[PDB]
Scaffold this active site. Structure first.
Site, PDB file in Angstrom:
ATOM      1  N   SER A   1       0.803  -1.217   0.000  1.00 33.72           N
ATOM      2  CA  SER A   1       0.000   0.000   0.000  1.00 33.72           C
ATOM      3  C   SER A   1       0.839   1.271   0.000  1.00 33.72           C
ATOM      4  CB  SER A   1      -0.938   0.004   1.208  1.00 33.72           C
ATOM      5  OG  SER A   1      -0.219   0.227   2.410  1.00 33.72           O
TER       6      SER A   1
ATOM      7  N   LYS B   1      -7.347   3.193   8.502  1.00 39.57           N
ATOM      8  CA  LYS B   1      -6.495   4.233   7.936  1.00 39.57           C
ATOM      9  C   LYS B   1      -7.134   5.609   8.055  1.00 39.57           C
ATOM     10  CE  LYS B   1      -3.697   1.710   4.554  1.00 39.57           C
ATOM     11  NZ  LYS B   1      -3.791   0.894   3.315  1.00 39.57           N
TER      12      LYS B   1
END
Lengths: 291, 179, 57, 168
Positions: A197, A240
């Protein structure tokens, strides 16, 4: 078995949980009551912002228990008949603030761009640091450190190649990435980290170093990057986004395929973020470097 | 065993602080924690609740802190070793039909101590199914009726103040760490 | 060969304790014998396998 | 426990420089050494542009007591200080002890085990100790009789450590 998610809490949710559950339970454990052991709302805000850093409330419960144990000791010892805690006397019950700053970087120099990560301990943020290893004037090189996993090292290699290709066409005269030796690092080197990511974050860090221009100060980005630059979806964006709100950012960059998963968040969480969805990295370039 | 015999415990903070100051030097943090625990017990009206666990390096003499606490609280002290234990019968005793049967160390503590509210130090609990039997002892929901294989009659251990020590916070029993 | 005893270790613990051996009870006699006056000496090849409850006695 | 960091050349100063690291250092400590080398290069370039010692010379870095394995990023700023002192030929303050991680941009991060390190420094005759600013809570939780004699300095970036360790 059925997968049921129990996500983390934002500062408002943590305060609401504490005021209604944590303080009443700790007071009952200590044998006190609200009439002589009052913990003001501002104290809980300070505890959440500075004495705890987590998605859960397990540390906040310990802090509240410590505060009320000290209050009980003060009450029984006869030092004070009733105890109320205030921000200017909080240090009498707990030590110095553990976390004095919300982010590692206040303003980001050109070599570093902010990013977000997801781990077993919940959402968190990381900064990809990048700087020269040799003075400028043969092939270049990229050194990576920070206990990066094999997948993340491969993602860093892909990001370096894509950044080289991007600069070969966006600015042909800038031979920075193709002739300079560069060292890349991710702080908290004792913590093992992995996952693809961080690709676009690494690309942004490399481009910002090469151009010598800082990224937007409150911008965080996530998303796997391909060799052609297409952004791919990543998982764990609930945590996140919770961490990004905790970190105090105002702009966030997400893969376009993840639009279906971002709006699952409650209204009060996403209301403060200038959310951007991207299909190809050129949009991330236009967002991070608007001028 | 002393049916219903009780020593009047003293929860005064001044007495406890003085006692901890006479026989212990330094370690003001542990003294502060013990004083806070005693104040909490005094407010609660009883010393039950979370079991105090003194953990640290080997050879620190954590037994002395428990001895001082027992002296201050006017609770008779007892020593209870569980290091390397594998047999539950040490906790709960052998069956009366066995040859040379002996009851558990808890009954020995009751007999030697001659009161129903001693202070029992379960030392080296991190080197302890033996784990399952210890939950039955430290859980107040079932502590009030302790049953052993020897006497085969329930005994009330409600007022016993259990204390424990360990060499590391990463104790090998998981369910015990919550209490 | 005190380091090779299988866990009998309980019997040795009962036997070597100065406060417990004073009334050492045997299955056959059914009466206690005061072994407090005897002198025990032990011997082992290595200290790694000796039981932990023995190492403090 | 106290450890020292030792650096010396492998060739006369008279191509890219190189750092040789020995001392049974763990992977994390070797990564910290690499980060420290890069940051020392950058810091010496920005502070003393004419001084090309770090970028041209070959340096061997050692941590004594080689029989004992060593791990942890706690030696971050220590390695930077050793490398800069070797590069400038300037000895550090003759009683200073320092600890704490260093980032690639020079920011100092908190490290654990403050009490043990402080006790070791006090027993080793240290009078001035440098700690990361985020370790202030850990340090002030110590009793007065442990730290009364230490001229403690708290830092956030290595630029302050440079001025503390290299006066004048």
């Amino acid at each position: 078995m059925e997968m049921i998610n129990v996500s983390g809490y934002v500062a408002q949710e943590k305060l609401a949980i504490a005021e209604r559950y944590l303080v009443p339970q700790a007071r009952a454990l200590c044998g006190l009551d609200e009439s002589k052991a009052k913990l003001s709302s501002d104290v809980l805000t300070l505890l959440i912002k500075q004495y705890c850093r987590e998605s859960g409330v397990r540390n906040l419960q310990k802090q509240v228990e410590k505060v009320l144990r000290k209050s009980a000791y003060k009450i029984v010892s006869g030092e004070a008949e009733s105890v109320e805690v205030t921000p200017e006397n909080l240090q009498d019950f707990v030590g110095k603030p553990v976390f004095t700053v919300e982010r590692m970087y206040d303003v980001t120099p050109p070599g570093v761009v902010m990013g977000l990560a997801w781990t077993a301990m919940g959402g968190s943020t990381l900064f990809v640091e990048t700087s020269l290893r040799r003075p400028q004037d043969k092939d270049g090189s990229l050194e990576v450190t920070g206990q990066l996993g094999e997948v993340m090292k491969e993602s860093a290699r892909i990001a370096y190649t894509f950044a080289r290709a991007f600069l070969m066409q966006h600015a042909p005269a800038n031979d920075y990435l193709v002739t300079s030796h560069i060292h890349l690092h991710v702080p908290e080197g004792a913590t093992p980290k992995d996952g693809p990511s961080a690709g676009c974050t690494i690309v942004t860090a490399l481009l910002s170093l090469a151009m010598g221009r800082p990224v937007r100060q409150n911008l965080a980005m996530t998303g796997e990057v391909s060799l052609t630059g297409k952004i791919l979806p990543v998982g764990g964006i609930k945590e996140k986004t919770i961490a990004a709100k905790r970190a105090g950012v105002t702009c966030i960059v997400l893969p376009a395929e993840n639009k279906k998963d971002f709006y699952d968040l409650a209204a009060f969480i996403t209301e403060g973020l200038e959310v951007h969805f991207v299909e190809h990295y050129r949009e991330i370039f236009d967002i991070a470097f608007p001028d | 065993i002393p049916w219903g015999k009780y020593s009047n415990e003293n929860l005064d903070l001044a007495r406890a602080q003085a006692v901890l100051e006479e026989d212990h030097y330094g370690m003001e943090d542990v003294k502060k924690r013990i004083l806070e625990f005693i104040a909490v017990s005094q407010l609660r009206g009883s010393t039950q609740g979370k079991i105090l666990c003194f953990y640290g390096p080997p050879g620190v003499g954590k037994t002395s802190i428990a001895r001082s606490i027992a002296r201050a609280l006017n609770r008779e002290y007892f020593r209870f070793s569980v290091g390397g234990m594998t047999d539950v019968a040490e906790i709960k005793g052998h069956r009366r039909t066995y040859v040379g049967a002996m009851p558990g160390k808890i009954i020995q503590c009751l007999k030697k101590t001659k009161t129903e509210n001693p202070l029992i130090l379960i030392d080296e609990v991190d080197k302890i199914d033996p784990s399952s039997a210890l939950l039955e002892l430290l859980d107040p929901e079932q502590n009030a009726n302790f049953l052993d294989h020897y006497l085969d009659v329930p005994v009330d251990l409600s007022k016993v103040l259990f204390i424990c020590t360990a060499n590391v916070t990463d104790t090998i029993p998981e369910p015990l760490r919550d209490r | 060969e005190v380091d090779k005893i299988g866990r009998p270790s309980s019997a040795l613990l009962e036997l070597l304790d100065p406060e417990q051996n004073a009334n050492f009870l045997d299955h056959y006699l059914d009466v206690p014998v005061d072994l407090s006056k005897v002198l025990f000496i032990c011997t082992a090849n290595v200290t790694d396998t000796i039981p932990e409850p023995l190492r403090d006695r």
